[PDB]
């Protein structure tokens, strides 16, 4: 509270040494380095006990340092000549704040994403002399932590040193178990793409070393169990973000061996009764997340073989599984879902109360904790549990345009829905009436829906298709090789005559008397939607003779010469769509119209897309 204005003046002081103009990076050592006195001032104002616990004056404190190091990549590699560059001094100092913030998952994710920016997007300026002085620094500071982890076997070690050694190894393994976008090729063991690096076998070595330490020691401290849950948190984070993460389905895995490793590792963690702690969600999150990746896909056998669950059952007790109420609850839900998909269809009935399919319960209850309803405010847990219990329903599967109409007109498919004539009239009454001026965002969502529904109109007389199994367009979304304008049909149906969605599009948007001020984003949206219409339908005649540019080609005039380059290069994408028709372009007059339009831009900023628009 006292120094929020101090940091708010310090960010202005950093931005005040920009340049004479708005373009400033300064990758070279300038011949005036006074802000390194601020750099020393930044991290030294971070390791302290009083007001770092406040969220804002820590987040702005590290955001100021990231804005300093972003617009000054020379500060990293400035060679504080002990033997090395100062980014080695930055890493081990940056480790201390993260090990002091071991428990808060916000304060270490947010530190490691910007530590990712400081080496990926900032030591691409230097390469060979400065890639191998931090990818060797991480190997040495990781060799040190795995080396000092093994002199606790001989028992002469300390206890707080054991604690911070475990936590520092946790943070070093936490940095490298992010997705590939955090640390790019900045570090030479995270180098390979295709989801399989030098760090993978090294990580599977170090987690087996720390499990060997957990077997070799014996301790029942409570917060030692607290820091012992973070290794299974780290090992579920290791596998849950190497996933390809498709549209709305389960994020599919890349390497079955890493899943086998993580399941075997946390099953070994449960066998030895490691990490039991009251009202802690960590192991429950791991079990539910990893079962969510293995619901009905190719990895369900890999889940049931390597994380065996049917040997902790013990139905006869209210303490239903052995471990802890959250962990027993999550494992009971996983057991319930495995037992449900084991049994046949006739052996299970629909609840009509919790909307989950369920088998004949028990001689006891044994069905409370699976649907109790769900737990204390641990917000991801109950939605994991909803997904595990509700993925069996085999209902209308999630689809992209069905999402974006259910995100827009909420609760729309409680009706016929898949019939096509009614969604046009729902979009029509929402596109004619329910806006006064407020929807400068909702109209852009409506025009991306009008873009996608325009394709779905074109799939009849392409009489078999449907609203639900339309994922993406076969013409506007997937693309093939060769000339991309061979794919669009010359004798496709005309837009005004048959496509009622172009009637909608011209009725609201292109005949609105304030086209030259919608917004730039609504112009881009109406250009995307008009691209989809004119790629699926023949555009109208550009001129009858009475002047008369036909309110869509007029929008091409408006955006093709506009100030921003985005509307220019987006409106150049429909200039070819006007050139492809028949009974409008059979004797080549739309071509001549587009030619004498493109012969009339003697303005310097339009030179890019014009060269595109010719070609």
């Amino acid at each position: 509270e006292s120094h929020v204005k101090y940091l708010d003046e310090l960010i202005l002081a950093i931005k005040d040494l920009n340049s004479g103009v708005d373009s400033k990076v300064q990758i070279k050592k300038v011949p005036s380095l006074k802000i390194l006195n601020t750099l020393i001032r930044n991290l030294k104002d971070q390791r302290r006990n009083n007001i770092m616990k406040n969220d804002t004056i820590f987040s702005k404190t590290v955001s100021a340092l990231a804005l300093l190091l972003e617009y000054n990549p020379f500060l990293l590699v400035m060679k504080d000549s002990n033997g090395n560059f100062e980014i080695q001094r930055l890493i081990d100092d940056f480790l201390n704040i993260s090990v002091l913030n071991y428990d808060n998952y916000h304060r270490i994710w947010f530190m490691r994403r910007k530590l990712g920016s400081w080496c990926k997007a900032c030591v691409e300026f230097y390469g060979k002399p400065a890639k191998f002085q931090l990818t060797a620094h991480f190997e040495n500071t990781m060799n040190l932590y795995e080396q000092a982890l093994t002199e606790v076997l001989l028992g002469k070690t300390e206890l707080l040193k054991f604690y911070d050694t475990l936590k520092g190894l946790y943070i070093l393994l936490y940095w490298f178990t992010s997705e590939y976008s955090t640390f790019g090729n900045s570090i030479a063991f995270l180098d390979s793409s295709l989801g399989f690096t030098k760090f993978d076998f090294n990580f599977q070595r170090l987690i087996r070393i720390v499990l060997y330490v957990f077997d070799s020691c014996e301790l029942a401290a409570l917060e030692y169990a607290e820091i012992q849950l973070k290794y299974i948190s780290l090992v579920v984070d290791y596998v849950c973000n190497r996933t390809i993460s498709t549209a709305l389905d389960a994020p599919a895995l890349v390497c079955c061996e890493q899943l086998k490793f993580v399941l075997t590792t946390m099953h070994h963690f449960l066998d030895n009764k490691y990490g039991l702690l009251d009202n802690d969600p960590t192991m429950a999150k791991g079990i539910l997340r990893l079962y969510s990746l293995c619901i009905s896909n190719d990895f369900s056998k890999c889940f049931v073989d390597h994380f065996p669950i049917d040997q902790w059952a013990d139905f006869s007790q209210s303490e239903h599984f052995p471990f802890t109420q959250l962990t027993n609850k999550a494992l009971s839900i996983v057991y319930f879902d495995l037992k449900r998909r084991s049994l046949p269809v006739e052996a299970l009935k629909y609840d009509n109360k919790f909307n989950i399919w369920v088998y004949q319960s028990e001689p006891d209850s044994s069905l409370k904790n699976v649907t109790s309803p769900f737990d204390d405010r641990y917000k991801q847990l109950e939605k994991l549990r909803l997904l595990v219990l509700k993925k069996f329903n085999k209902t209308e599967r999630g689809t992209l345009l069905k999402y974006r109409v259910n995100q827009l007109s909420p609760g729309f498919f409680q009706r016929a829905g898949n019939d096509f004539k009614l969604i046009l009239n729902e979009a029509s009454v929402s596109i004619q009436t329910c806006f006064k001026t407020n929807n400068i965002t909702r109209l852009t969502s409506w025009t991306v829906i009008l873009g996608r529904l325009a394709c779905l109109e074109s799939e009849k007389f392409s009489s078999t298709k449907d609203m639900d199994n339309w994922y993406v367009c076969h013409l506007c979304d997937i693309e093939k090789t060769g000339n991309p304008f061979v794919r669009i049909n010359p004798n496709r149906p005309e837009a005004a005559g048959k496509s009622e969605i172009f009637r909608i599009l011209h009725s609201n948007f292109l005949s609105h008397p304030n086209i030259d001020e919608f917004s730039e984003s609504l112009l881009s949206g109406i250009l995307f939607s008009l691209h989809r219409i004119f790629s699926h339908f023949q555009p109208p005649k550009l001129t009858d003779g009475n002047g008369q540019i036909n309110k869509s080609f007029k929008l091409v005039q408006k955006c093709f010469m506009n100030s921003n380059r985005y509307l220019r290069l987006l409106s150049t994408r429909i200039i070819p769509l006007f050139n492809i028709s028949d009974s409008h372009n059979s004797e080549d007059e739309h071509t001549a119209t587009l030619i004498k339009f493109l012969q009339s831009q003697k303005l310097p900023v339009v030179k890019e897309n014009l060269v595109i628009a010719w070609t």
Partner: protein, 558 residues
Amino acid sequence: LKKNMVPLNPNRIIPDETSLFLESILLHQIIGADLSTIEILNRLKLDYITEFKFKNFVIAKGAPIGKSIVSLLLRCKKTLTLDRFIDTLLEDIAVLIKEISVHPNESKLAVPFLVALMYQIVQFRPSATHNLALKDCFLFICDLIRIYHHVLKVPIHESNMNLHVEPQIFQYELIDYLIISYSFDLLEGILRVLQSHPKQTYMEFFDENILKSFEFVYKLALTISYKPMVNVIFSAVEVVNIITSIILNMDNSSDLKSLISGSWWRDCITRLYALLEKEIKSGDVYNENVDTTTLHMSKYHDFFGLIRNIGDNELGGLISKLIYTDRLQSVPRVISKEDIGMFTAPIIGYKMEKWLLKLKDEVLNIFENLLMIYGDDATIVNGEMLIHSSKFLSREQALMIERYVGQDSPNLDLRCHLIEHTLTIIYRLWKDHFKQLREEQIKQVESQLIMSLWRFLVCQTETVTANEREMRDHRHLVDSLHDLTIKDQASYYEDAFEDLPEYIEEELKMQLNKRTGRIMQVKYDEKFQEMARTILESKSFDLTTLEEADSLYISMGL
């Protein structure tokens, strides 16, 4: 006195690692198959080799083969410790694969499952596999691939009178596709477990024969005149990645470098150039189309493989339906070839594009590595990394701006990561390797270099974003898929994304904004603007004169 120390466990159960390895062999199962691998080998006999025997590893004539594997496993669990149990299994299963392979009459159905079993043996404990076993296994898998010489040598186009009146059978083709793909996957696995050994002992692996054998099999995989099998292209370039990555990360790097000729690299890099200039298009990945221009992942080899899950595994049911499962046989169960193929989803095409874009990221990543190996000039860091990489950068900016913006595919970001990566492959080639950028070669790509730098410096205008209100309206138009991704990550899979304290989503409404800027092709990152600025404007070479440069600056503003 000092009651602080952590107390040991008096009854430490150090787990028997050879028992765990025995169990991982016994319940090894490849993805999509009904039986386990040992349980498939219990259903296989070899009825032309009347008596196999190498070193007390007798197989009878009609006996199950997996009977003899599990007999070897039980017999050598008692005796050998783990580092000897591994190479005993490696050489015995290698000799069995060998004399099943070099035989005129015998079916080779045991060979894919023995290679997959061998891969499970190698990668179990990478510290336990001694690297002379890795050397012998590498040489065996390379000449195993040169035995199966003809799988990677089918011609591009057939006769006009190649009548397709033939029984149209797939089972033998499925077997030797599995043999080649599991063999290349095993080569990748050998080199990544060799990558995990301590960095003083790489010379126990490498000699002349390693690099000659991989040179042969690498010319075989990344083909020119034959139909490409994409499965082996992934692994064959990941091997070259592991090679460059350990040349970077060993101390006595000279012995690898003195062991490698110049002809090895200048035959490798031209095939990488020919791979980098191929097209990745969703609508005709799985099509069969014009050769050597579209990375296409043929229908007739669509299964996972031993490391990475590469297709949708459409041929995984046929691995299980390759045997009768209630019978002990040698010939395969008949798989009809034209029954597969039956239309539901082009999402499969999107994720196969995702793999192929990661493949091109891999190729220009090993370009980035061997810039750093050969920092001094050589035959190979020779200026054609301006030509091929600037052709690549210019075309993947061009058809990004013309085709992909607003096409709601997941693969846009990675496709505009490639350009954002290959600029740096330009940039450190520009700043740190100008001594070999020959003047005649720069003018071969003076169009494309200058235009590709211009499409980064056009973003310094930035009259598009400038706020927050219309940028999220733009990301409804271009980047709704990543909103679905980040909501599924936030509600299920990320520990930091619950109880968001109004500093962790104000980073999200910075980085989704810079993401959708970098996708929308206006407002890239400022650092890449600087890297593109300090190539064109810098006076290391006169790309433009001072009256030709401001003709480019007037086409932004300026």
